[PDB]
Amino acid sequence: MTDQAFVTLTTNDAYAKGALVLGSSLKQHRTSRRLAVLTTPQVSDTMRKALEIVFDEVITVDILDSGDSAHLTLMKRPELGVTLTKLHCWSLTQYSKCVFMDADTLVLANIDDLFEREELSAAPDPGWPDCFNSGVFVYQPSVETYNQLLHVASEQGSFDGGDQGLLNTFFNSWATTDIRKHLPFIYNLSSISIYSYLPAFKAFGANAKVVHFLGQTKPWNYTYDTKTKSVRSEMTHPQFLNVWWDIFTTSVVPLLQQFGL
Amino acid sequence: MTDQAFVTLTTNDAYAKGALVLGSSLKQHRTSRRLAVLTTPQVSDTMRKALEIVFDEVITVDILDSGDSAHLTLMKRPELGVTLTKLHCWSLTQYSKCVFMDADTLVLANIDDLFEREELSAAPDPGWPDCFNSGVFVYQPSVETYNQLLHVASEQGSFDGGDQGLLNTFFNSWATTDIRKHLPFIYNLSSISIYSYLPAFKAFGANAKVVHFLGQTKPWNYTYDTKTKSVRSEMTHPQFLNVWWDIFTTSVVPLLQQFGL
């Protein structure tokens, strides 16, 4: 399906690493859909060039420019920069349906069956289960919806200062309507939950399809030993970090190196 | 409705305090249903007598006795004692539909509308959102269901060592079926979530109808100043603890005192 795609975002080089790993993981699990990534001018040329190889489409978004539709809203609420940039995922009208995934997520299995879902489908957020986690969600690109979201960001802002607060406010019937719009937790497994409720992780964690690396320390912030093939504890959670690093080590770094020549 | 009731449980005197506060809170918010409480022989006579005043019905359960239906299962899995005692809520066939509530919960508003729900309806558990939290749930008493649950406890036990693991295993279609069986999080608000996702609590916490005191330190473990009417920090969470203590101070203690004469 050329009209459907997975979409991610990177506003700097650190998250670009995440996006490259994410995109590679989707290729690894043979998705039949297109891969697109939103990028900002702050992403270095070498990183953008790597993204052009992994992703089918690289879209540049610069909300800092007066010409951008979200710029005016940005001036009003500057703390929503990342959010407003992410909302541009709805401007990708070349696609009929997409699955947005933050650059700090990792695909562990084919999840093309997510395209059978309707907007707005997302997994429950741990912490406050009646809000969905915005790390992974099925949506339909639309200039109308995009403009509607910008209007809410402008008028109300976000209750949590992030894109998750804004998205939950706009798509507020999620908790009480249509069980099909509740994506199983394994489609966006919070790396945090592998502690808050370990018994449940032990019981159902083996079915994880997507891992969402939350917390201050992102995957790229860890130290990885290529010999033992494991991150340094310097947790029941290393298993996922090691997958991320194996892909980074095996496919992403070799790729970034071919640019030196 | 004399055929419907709220049901709780207390296996000792500490939780009996919780049950008395819970029952009082339900009376405070004028429930039209009956109030029932499961008790064990370990609850002192004075506490049982207090329970007989607050609750419409006090049922004694002693799984330690060979005559109890759950005894055999208890010998097999002794760590499930509390769970097996709680399962006896399904033996209350004098009721057609009930809302079970753990003794460490607190009602903040009338929640009689829960009786419009079907078994098994429960709110999402923070931590692992695809499991429901067993602190509050709508069920239908039935010897058949009770026996079926005992069979699962005997054969598989509980993945989390508690009643929540067992209930989720038996009522396993909850996460993927019928959005109406997902009780809003405000019907069983985890006291923990008032930190894990404070922004969400600030945004929707004001609508809390039931608070579930989780964590090692229960409400009765805190020190309460009757003058300032607030617990001692010795948190955005005190508001709920103070309600609990106000009811305990105002209605429960005065009640327990009338037994000295």
Hey, which residues does B188 pair with through a beta bridge? none
Helices A13-28 + A238-247 axis angle, to 10: 90
Q: How far is CA A119 from CA A124, A135, B61, B175, in A?
A: 15, 14, 49, 19
Distance in angstroms (rounded) separating the CA atoms of residues B173 and B159: 16
Q: Is residue B207 less than 8 Å (CB to CB) from chain A?
A: no
CA distance B170 to A223: 42
Going along chain A, which residue ranges are E strands? 4-10, 34-39, 57-60, 97-101, 105-107, 121-124, 132-139, 189-190, 210-212, 224-225, 230-231
Q: Which residues of A touch B125 (CB under 8 A)?
A: 129, 197
d(CA A243, CA B140): 45
Residue A110, judged by CB atoms within 10 A of its CB (0-12, 13-18, 19+), counts as middle
Choose among B121, B106, B61: nearest CA to B88: B61
Which of chain A's residues have a Cβ under 8 Å away from the Cβ of B202?
159
CB neighbourhood size of A255 (10 A): 16
Whether residue A203 and residue B124 make contact (CB cut-off 8 A), yes or no, is: no
Experimental method, per PDB record: X-ray
Segment (H or E) for B122 = strand B121-124
Residue B167 CB-half CA count within 13 A = 28
Q: Which residues in B180-190 are b (16+ Cβ under 10 Å) and which e?
A: ebbbbbbbbbb
Q: Which helix (H) or strand (E) element contains residue B124?
A: strand B121-124
Asked if residue A19 lies in contact with residue A37, where contact means CB atoms within 8 angstroms, the answer is yes
Tokens representing B217?
């330190």
In sequence order, what are the residues at sequence separation of 6 or more whose Cβ sits closer than 8 angstroms to the Cβ of residue B191? B211, B212, B213, B214, B215, B237, B240
Rounded distance, CA A100 to CA A237, Å? Answer: 24
Query: Which of B:84-143 have CB within 8 Å of A?
Result: 123-131
Provide the pairing of β-strand A105-107 with B189-190.
unpaired
Chain-chain contact of A197 with B131 (C-beta, under 8 angstroms): yes
Of the candidates A247, A225, A226, the one whose C-alpha atom is nearest the C-alpha of residue A234 is A225
Q: Which of B161, B179, B203 sits opposite A179 (nearest CB)?
A: B179
Report cis status (omega within 30 of 0) of the bond before B183: no
Distance between CA B88 and CA A152 in Å, rounded? Answer: 50
Q: Amino acid identity, residue B192?
A: I
Cβ within 8 Å of residue A93, ≥6 positions away: A141, A142, A143
DSSP B8-74: EEESSHHHHHHHHHHHHHHHHTT-SSEEEEEE-TTS-HHHHHHHHHHSSEEEE--TTSTTSTTHHHH
| Chain centroid, CA A236 distance in Å | 23
Task: Tell me the CB-side half-sphere exposure of residue A255, using CA atoms within 13 A.
Answer: 21
Closest alpha carbon within chain A to B178:
A179
Handedness of CA B138, B139, B141, B146 (dihedral sign): negative
**Resolution reached, in Å?**
1.9
Residue with tokens 């508690």: B162
Q: How would you classify the pairing of strands B57-60 and B34-39?
A: parallel
CATH homologous superfamily, domain B1-261: Spore Coat Polysaccharide Biosynthesis Protein SpsA; Chain A (3.90.550.10)
Instruction: Provide the 10 A C-beta neighbour count for residue B45.
Output: 8
At a CB cut-off of 8 Å and minimum separation 6, what does B9 contact? B15, B19, B37, B38, B39, B85, B86, B89, B102, B103
Q: Is A86 annotated as a binding residue?
A: yes
Report residue A139 CA to chain centroid gap. 13
Q: B129 vs A128: CB contact, 8 Å cut-off?
A: no
Chain A neighbors of B163, CB-CB under 8 A = none
Burial class (CB in 10 A: 0-12, 13-18, 19+), A129: buried
B132 min Cα distance to partner chain A (Å): 10
Go through A136-164 and write b for each residue having 16 or more CB atoms within 10 A of its CB, e for each that does not.
bbbbebeeebbeebbebbbeebbbbebbb
Q: What is the DSSP letter of A80?
A: G
Cis amide prior to A20 (ω within 30 degrees): no
In which order are the strands placed within the sheet that holds A210-212? A105-107, A210-212, A189-190
Cβ pair B127:A200 closer than 8 A: yes
- The answer to whether the Cβ–Cβ distance between A161 and B125 falls below 8 Å is no
A212 carries a ligand binding annotation: yes
Name chain B contacts of A83, Cβ cutoff 8 Å. Answer: none
Query: How many Å apart are CA B218 and CA B38, to the nearest integer?
Result: 20
Contact B120, B139 (CB under 8 A): yes
Q: Which of B131, B201, B202 sits opposite A200 (nearest CB)?
A: B131
Identity of the amino acid at B78? P
Cβ–Cβ contact A193 with B under 8 A:
yes
β-pairing, A132-139 vs A97-101, is antiparallel
Nearest to A126 among B126, B199, B202 (CB): B126
CB contact under 8 A, A203 and B175: no
Q: Do A129 and B129 touch (CB under 8 A)?
A: yes
Within the 168-187 window of chain B, which residues sit less than 8 Å (CB to CB) from chain A?
A: 175-179, 182, 184-186
Chain-centre distance for alpha carbon A29: 17
CB B124 within 8 A of CB B31: no
Q: Please give the helix or strand (H or E) that residue B231 lies within, else none.
A: strand B230-231
| Residue B173 CB partners (closer than 8 Å, separation 6+) | none
